[model samples]
Target chain A: VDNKFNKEQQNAFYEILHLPNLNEEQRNAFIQSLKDDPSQSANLLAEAKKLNDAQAPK
Target chain B: VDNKFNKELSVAGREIVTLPNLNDPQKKAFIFSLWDDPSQSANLLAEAKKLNDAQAPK
Candidate 1:
């Protein structure tokens, strides 16, 4: 609940949005939306990770 | 199918251990594990988010 955790959550989200294959526009949009929402970001990132990993061969 | 996912494939017998880009020694342990396995990272990060979010005010 403190700012420490909030900062960590935000930073982690920024990292997720920065992953390859996510276009800059989409990444920035996600980043801005999550600036005040870490929980929604939590769910969205989980899904986005799937999108990125679905590309993996194995 | 509701309980995430699984397959006959496995890693070292145990259900695969994982966490996102965890930086602490404990975190590093998982992040390292998922380094080669994307799905494992899914479970790990999903697990970690719960822990982190559990502490959330909302």
Candidate 2:
């Protein structure tokens, strides 16, 4: 059932993995987290943005 | 500097890219968003969890 990501999804995963600012530990942790719950991959970014907005200065 | 990620990162990245449930256009959009702001990489997961907690059913 794995290996089902379409072209766009594949590209996005590749781009994120290749991002310049991500260090080894951060990259690994992010990947591991995703692997832990692949279903959350879709909402992870949206949820992250919400957290960022909440933590931002008023 | 681009190749700094260790073997583990590569393997993990490959794993997530192959997950079946991760096949979504939003996955691509999320990655593109991260590419635009790589600094968010380190905090992405942490922030995601915070937001998830806040939105959880009471």
Candidate 3:
């Protein structure tokens, strides 16, 4: 997120990007959108990361 | 107003209000507290409603 994401959020976004079933075009679309405006584009992105962060093996 | 989940659950076509994510400590706390109230409370409330319906008639 050249616009507004921190390393933590980007790390979280990367996990979802790496999902085996994720479509490449969808991934690129999100990446491009985030590059355009992270606030709007990254709410869901950040939330999923937050969910994964809280639920990941601790 | 109390911040419980705005969500739903269903059996076949029937609807319900199932819990949402509970990975964070605060969300977990909110849910566990609801669990305590709903454990006995939901059953008892449903039971009372059933009794009331039996007496109230159509």
Candidate 4:
């Protein structure tokens, strides 16, 4: 099925997929969410960064 | 706290965070994975791209 996502959206999607921490289940779920609503991409990306920053070592 | 990630790595990290699909739990997991071993960034990005391609419309 063709997706409606543009280049930037596609890049964001792939970038999210590249994340090292998510397991198969989480990844799949996240994909589904993106598929369900591509508009949330920016917010989701922000959330991911926030979490990453929180975990970074001093 | 300063992160060990370089510019490319940091961009990768932020990009992963921007993905819209991951929930809080999954996002955290992915971030932790990066934090634990960042060398996997390249591998993870490749994997993410592979997954993205697989999901692309035929």
Taking every candidate in turn, the Cα RMSD to the unseen true structure, in Å, is 15.8, 15.5, 16.6, 15.6
lDDT of 2 by residue, A1-58 (tens): 5653333333434443544444445444544444344455434333333434554467
- What lDDT would candidate 2 get against the real structure? 0.41
**Which rank order by TM-score, best down to worst?**
4, 1, 2, 3
Between 2 and 3, whose TM-score is larger? 2
**Candidate 4 lDDT by residue in tens digits, B12-54:** 4444554444334444445445534556755544443444454
Order of quality (lDDT): 4, 1, 2, 3
DockQ of each: 0.02, 0.10, 0.01, 0.04
Higher-scoring candidate on lDDT, 2 or 3: 2
lDDT value, residue A4 of candidate 1: 49
Candidate 1: tens digits of C-alpha lDDT, residues B1-58? 2221222111210122222323244443443343334345457555544544444431
Q: Residues A1-58, candidate 3: write the lDDT tens digits.
A: 2634543233323433433333344443444344344364456455445545564567
Lowest-sum lDDT 10-residue window in model 2 chain A:
A4-13
lDDT against the true structure, per candidate, is 0.41, 0.41, 0.34, 0.46
| Model 3 DockQ, alpha carbons vs. true complex | 0.01
Off by over 4 Å in 4: A1-5, A50-58, B1-58
Q: Comparing to the true complex, what docking class would candidate 3 get?
A: incorrect
Clashing pairs in 2: none
Best by DockQ: 2
